[PDB]
């Protein structure tokens, strides 16, 4: 009879995971360092 299923196989992995990745936390510290050396130069 015309009745058959199917199964899928996934080609899914791309740009790193959502912001649970370390990109944002990494970005955080640079601004603090900028503040520090701005102080020193002034």
């Amino acid at each position: 009879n015309p009745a058959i299923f199917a199964s899928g196989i996934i080609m899914d992995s791309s740009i790193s995971k959502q912001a649970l990745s370390e990109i944002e936390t990494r970005h955080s510290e640079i601004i603090k360092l900028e503040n520090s050396i701005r102080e020193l130069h002034d």
Partner: peptide, 22 residues
């Protein structure tokens, strides 16, 4: 000293930043 930033996504952007820090 081997680097300054984690290579979460490699890419050219991660090089110069590190270089700058160095």
């Amino acid at each position: 000293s081997g680097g300054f930033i984690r290579r979460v996504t490699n890419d050219a952007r991660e090089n110069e930043m590190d270089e700058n820090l160095e």
